Amino acid sequence: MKKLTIGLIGNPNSGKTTLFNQLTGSRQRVGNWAGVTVERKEGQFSTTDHQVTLVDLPGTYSLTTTSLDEQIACHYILSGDADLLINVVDASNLERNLYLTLQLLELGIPCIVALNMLDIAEKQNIRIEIDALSARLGCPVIPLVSTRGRGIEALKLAIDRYKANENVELVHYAQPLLNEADSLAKVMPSDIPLKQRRWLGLQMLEGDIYSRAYAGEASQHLDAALARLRNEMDDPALHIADARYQCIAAICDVVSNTLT
């Protein structure tokens, strides 16, 4: 029977392991990711409507390439096996944790954010405006309330309702970066979704070596693209990164408040 396949992804020590264990109970298996020694855990659970296979991805700060854990995560996410992702986000380290989230959203893969460590955040005098965050991300943000399994039940509701992320304005990259990324995208393997081709383009311009492997013929055009960009601006690779952090910072200014 065909399952609904969900990738579980987050930063190291984000609560992702405990969530995995809570969802799957005894219904889990362990092996290794193909060709490496890194453990691959997956398990099963059900919602009202769906039988789910949950694949636990290694903890990572980003999808950018350098730990195996990060390339494994990226490779799975680009493989297209998952129908959606649950992104476990530490509320007590929101700004840091959102770097990964933004990468997932830019790839356009359907996401649900599971917001964890709400107790820690409160104790650090931080309240998160959950709907304000969901609005800026374009995806559901579910608070993982521990009391009486409420968070888990809300997460399962969200799974039964999962949909494409909204086309919110996210990172606002300089137009030359977008132009060059799109020209690379045009050359890449046609069967790769356009969003992902464009993301790959930007990763290659940032200097991500692994992204080149996906990009087929595009990799031959990257030096010419970088030459143009270097003429147009100071440190194009840093402009890519700075756009991302600016975006995150602007979200967090609204969403994360003092509790006092």
Curated annotation (Swiss-Prot):
Domain FeoB-type G residue range list: 3-165
Amino-acid positions noted as binding GTP in the UniProt annotation, renumbered to this chain: N116, M117, L118, D119, V145, S146, T147
UniProt subcellular location: Cell inner membrane
Summary of the knockout phenotype: Poor uptake of Fe(2+).
Effect upon mutating R148A: GTP hydrolysis rate 1.3-fold slower than wild-type
Binding-site positions, GTP 3: D56, L57, P58, G59
Cysteines paired by S-S bonds: none
Induction: Iron uptake is repressed by the global regulator Fur in presence of Fe(2+). Induced by hydroxyurea.
Binding site for GTP 1: G10, N11, P12, N13, S14, G15, K16, T17
Annotated GTP 2 binding sites: G35, V36, T37, V38, E39
NFeoB, GTPase protein domain, binds GTP but not ATP as annotated region, ranges: 1-260
Ranges in the topological domain labelled Cytoplasmic: 1-260
Domain notes: Contains a guanine-nucleotide-specific nucleotide-binding site (about residues 1-276) that shows slow GTP hydrolysis. When a non-hydrolyzable GTP analog binds to the trimeric N-terminal domain, it induces a structural shift which opens a pore.
Family as reported in the entry's similarity comment: Belongs to the TRAFAC class TrmE-Era-EngA-EngB-Septin-like GTPase superfamily. FeoB GTPase (TC 9.A.8) family.
Function: Transporter of a GTP-driven Fe(2+) uptake system, probably couples GTP-binding to channel opening and Fe(2+) uptake. A guanine nucleotide-binding protein (G proteins) in which the guanine nucleotide binding site alternates between an active, GTP-bound state and an inactive, GDP-bound state. This protein has fast intrinsic GDP release, mediated by the G5 loop (about residues 149-158). Presumably GTP hydrolysis leads to conformational changes and channel closing.
SUBUNIT field: The isolated N-terminal domain (residues 1-274) forms trimers.
Protein name: Fe(2+) transporter FeoB
Phylogenetic placement of the source organism: Bacteria, Pseudomonadati, Pseudomonadota, Gammaproteobacteria, Enterobacterales
Gene designation: feoB
Portion of the full-length sequence here: 1 to 264 of 773
